[model samples]
Target: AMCIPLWPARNGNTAHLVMCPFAGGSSSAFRHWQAEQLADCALSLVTWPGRDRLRHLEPLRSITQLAALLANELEASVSPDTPLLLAGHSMGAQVAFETCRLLEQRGLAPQGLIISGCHAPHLHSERQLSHRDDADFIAELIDIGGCSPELRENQELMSLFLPLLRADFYATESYHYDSPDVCPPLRTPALLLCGSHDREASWQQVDAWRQWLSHVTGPVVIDGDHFYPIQQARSFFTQIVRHFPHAFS
Candidate 1:
């Protein structure tokens, strides 16, 4: 895993926000978010292999491996004075949650968890399946409408991003959730943000997260499709800043 910090050191802000991208996405996807949504907080975007600058590196094949890599990198990079926040979208949400659980096992916890555009983990209890066949997988992509039109329009772009998407889907699908003897109540508050038209995650499905998060302080349904973060960035940023005053002030 690679981590990119987006703030200048002189900012004197000890709070940090780590962002995880959806499948087929890289840290670049959240580049604008740091400037708009978390301008006052230090932003660090996590980059998994097989994407962005780590394109040559091998993509992780399991959540356990991904979590381990994240925890290690986070421990090394984040300062002790920094209170960390975890934010992830779609498949990244699962990665964030699993990583948080791993951090808990290691006696580390973040200040908050922001899960966006994903249904609760328990709702996606379907058996794992492979998508080697491009057609079927593309259909799934269309169903989610998560990727940008540029990638969807340009075959070359699709070729470049599709493999990463497929790998991400494979990793997420193969994930097996272990029922903890005692689930740790979320130490930090959780914020659930979803699009009204995100078929993959409805308001009901998003609210189901209450079961998993002990402190779900904010849940918002924005108007747009799965890619609402891009479409309604202003509103999204407003909500985030309102909830996380330290990040804004």
Candidate 2:
């Protein structure tokens, strides 16, 4: 309830797509994405705490806490009849993996897991997220490159945005990778989507995902860098829906 911020979907049909953005975003993060109506799948969006509807809540700083919150909210209020098709971008994808595992234990395992951007989990990803030095920190965000021009120019807006952005960005950078023996084998069909020129996760980084999920289908390279899904919505979402059950067909 607290975690799922948006459910812009058909009245009643097909599966549910529970997703979240890379970092530093609001409910509008997936605005264009949900509008696609990808084969009738319900678009349930994940918003980090302390933003949007949960703005008053304290922000979370760990993957376990975030995923557990998502699972708790979904199990308590959301139904599972249509089945689920889980997806997320960047830091959201890290959150998605643990959330999907919890859903699996409840017998609501997803038909497929679609993750975009970011490097594979098992690989060494302890890169520093420079949030201290303003210029350097801003430069890092510049590299991610998903901000709007309005926000970029608005100093007052950037002030309010930076704190949560730091929390989420660091949460991603500080994520502790569990050993393969400790994590569950998703064996679930999966598709790894990434930008061809992504510096965060090159094709090699995408391929390293074989350790985290089984039956992986791709490092589907489209045009753009880290934020390709946002940059190329039609091609990304279209290829994503191809994995869904005939709901979108």
Candidate 3:
């Protein structure tokens, strides 16, 4: 629920870019992103409880709670003078979308939505799997290869990131989607990016977002697996800056 600000003093007259990391990640994960991709605009990173320095805090167990907390933080902290753009990866994308919907209801919508490395909300997994056991979750992480090998191999590092990961899994697993009421399509332009090698998401699944966006600008596929951001950071940032030049202007 807490928000972390990055490069606030650099916003100038440009738009603000808020980056949200995937589950089990902290704002620190995107520190390089703010420096490289959005050097001109203000950069804010959203951090859920129970991760990184907030590791001791209780983790949110539901999507509703997560969205509510995000709404409250955004309302209190974000500057109205700067236009807002949201970027989220994996589970963070779902959180970003739901939170944006809540922001819209309160008449404070973002200008753009950048969704990366995630399947559409309606296309998420239907099965429930428990990752409460550390070993089982580690196995999944190993197969996914999203986390660094050092962290995956070291028990101490795993201890640090595991609570946040569990919280995210719980939020995702507990989410219930009843087709939402027919509301106006999102006014914000959407940029969807995914990895060509990601098995969980397909071009068809990502293309489905077009129906909900004012403009579905990109479902651009880059070479790599689900964790493309780590391997392809340069290309990813290049594409993002190209699409959102105001962020770097």
Candidate 4:
């Protein structure tokens, strides 16, 4: 109960969407999206530590740590027979992929996984922003347009946000692909997505996701930048749901 931050489709329905948000974001990031679309299915919104209900709990440091915790929560919150869908944006995308991996190990397969706003899971970045100089990290966040000038301008806000953002960037930067002899294309239907104007993850990186996912068809280009999934919630939500019908059929 403490781990399950949201229960949009709490009726033991056949459809479940486990949603995770970006760094420094809370379940509230997808709150309105769930309110609009949960009627058709449930939204198992993920709230990371330091925000909302889990605000008291310290956020996990690595992608593996967060993913493992999410998998742990799924055992209690999800209906065994329900059709599961996993979606995550930005850093959340990395977390979502690892969660899917854990579920697959347990002999459970998601109906589909829609990964948005991230690079291929196997791609590695050596920049190590997590331990990088603050100025450099802040500059990169500004370049990515994920950080607000307002937050950067206010000394206290920057102090509070920089560490969280660094941890998130670190979770991503420090990550390196592993295991599979060559590649392990998930059996689950996969969809790649990103904003046409996204600067953080270029179209090329998102497009290459098909290389890692055998079932993935092609990349979907939305109209906004890195944050388009939430920026264009209605359209994004609608398109994502359409996949479930195909996945379940």
Candidate 5:
């Protein structure tokens, strides 16, 4: 299954939170979130193909295809009585948004979406990192602060991770918003979050999500940059809890 349950749904659960990770990220990225003291909500994280134990499978280069696969898994995993919330960061935001669209088409739309560190889908970026040379690509990853310096220094690890990163970057960079097969204006409530210092996805650019979604909360300025979700995960989860009642109700 694409979803790895951190806290599986229980009898009294009111909502199921499915977190999608950023490019070059896996379910492990949100490991700490499982320790948060959340009530009435079950937590799970999405994993892409070729991730961890799924390494035998080919990683996807199309966001739509990834979303399509994820939507099916979500439909099977989540019970009808429980509300569903999709939360994603950076490239993951695009993945979650596309998954939401496909789910909506299948009449399984999520209750809400939490998009962080990403601009609205329609915003086209000419920047492509997948084609960059190894040194340059690693440099860009360093600039984004997603990869640790120590990890960068580990040649063996880098060799293992580079292919997945390339495929994910391609998926993120090649993505086109609302492709004909998946076109559907989002009808769900959305909460937008961006790091104040993140040039990659500034709050102003994130705010454009308002135009596409039926109802949107802030492109709330959290304290940090592209990796804010990791740097300020506590604050981020708090915001989610504070808004949860309103968003899910």
Candidate 6:
């Protein structure tokens, strides 16, 4: 499955939200939303290439390719009349951004977009880690604070994990966005979020998205670190639903 459904639309629900994951992240990233019970929105999490059940596939190192994959899946699976929303965190933000662009080009623009913990794609390049040695790369991942202690300690696990991380880092660092004049600002309503303490996606960098997005909200600073979306799941998702007032009705 390109996406894993966590909550299906029932009764009056009118929107479908598809969330992308951070680098080396998978569907589990947004699993916490399962019980959030967001009104009027059905939730699904991306199952990216070369990870989880799709491990047999080679990981892609291009934002365009990944976005195309996601856009195609959504185009096929979602009904034309049902509104769509796209959201992502960290590296996933790049994917969601590109996916929204592609979807718009195809005349299926989403109703809303939510980006968290990421600099605008055109602002700066990701620090290149794909070329580093395993020892250095693993050390950086540990310092980044997403990997668990047990996962950090186990070299055997690292062997399987490193490849996907390298590929994703490559994708993030290598992405190139067309200039605004060429690409045009997106018409979708956007909500930008970040952690107050997040060094990775600073408020200024997150706010840069306003140039590419015609209608955008805060790079709303919540209290926490880079992993705040999960660490502060309630607050994070609450802000998202609040942005869509009609979602409640």
Q: TM-scores across all candidates?
A: 0.82, 0.86, 0.82, 0.85, 0.89, 0.91
**Model 5 lDDT vs. the true structure?**
0.80
| Candidate 1 lDDT tens digits, 28-122 | 66666656543557766778887777888878877668778887888777766677778777777778877776766666777778888776766
Model 3 lDDT tens row, 186-207: 7666788888987656667667
The local distance difference test score of model 3 is 0.70
> How do all the candidates rank in terms of TM-score, highest first?
6, 5, 2, 4, 1, 3
Better of 1 and 5 by lDDT: 5
RMSD of each: 3.4, 2.9, 3.2, 3.0, 2.7, 2.1
Error of 5 at 211 (Å): 2.9
Write the residue-wise lDDT of candidate 2 on 20-124 in tens digits.
677776777667765555445666778788888888887898876898988787777666655667787888888888887887877766677888876777765
lDDT of 6: 0.82
Tens-place lDDT digits, model 5, residues 46-127: 8898987777899989988988999888888777777899988988899898898888878887888899988777775445
Per-prediction count of colliding residue pairs?
0, 3, 0, 1, 0, 0
1-249: candidate 6 lDDT, tens digit per residue: 678888888777788888888888766666677766655578888877788888889988898799999999888888888788899998889889989988898999888899999888677744557767877777777778777657667788887887788888888878756565667888878999989998678888888888889889998888999889788987887888888765434
Best by TM-score: 6
Q: Pick the candidate with the highest lDDT.
A: 6
Which ten residues in a row are the worst by lDDT in model 4? 1-10
Runs in model 5 deviating more than 4 A are 8-11, 125-127, 149-155, 178-182, 246-249
User: Model 6: residues >4 Å from true position, as ranges?
Assistant: 35-40, 125-128, 149-155
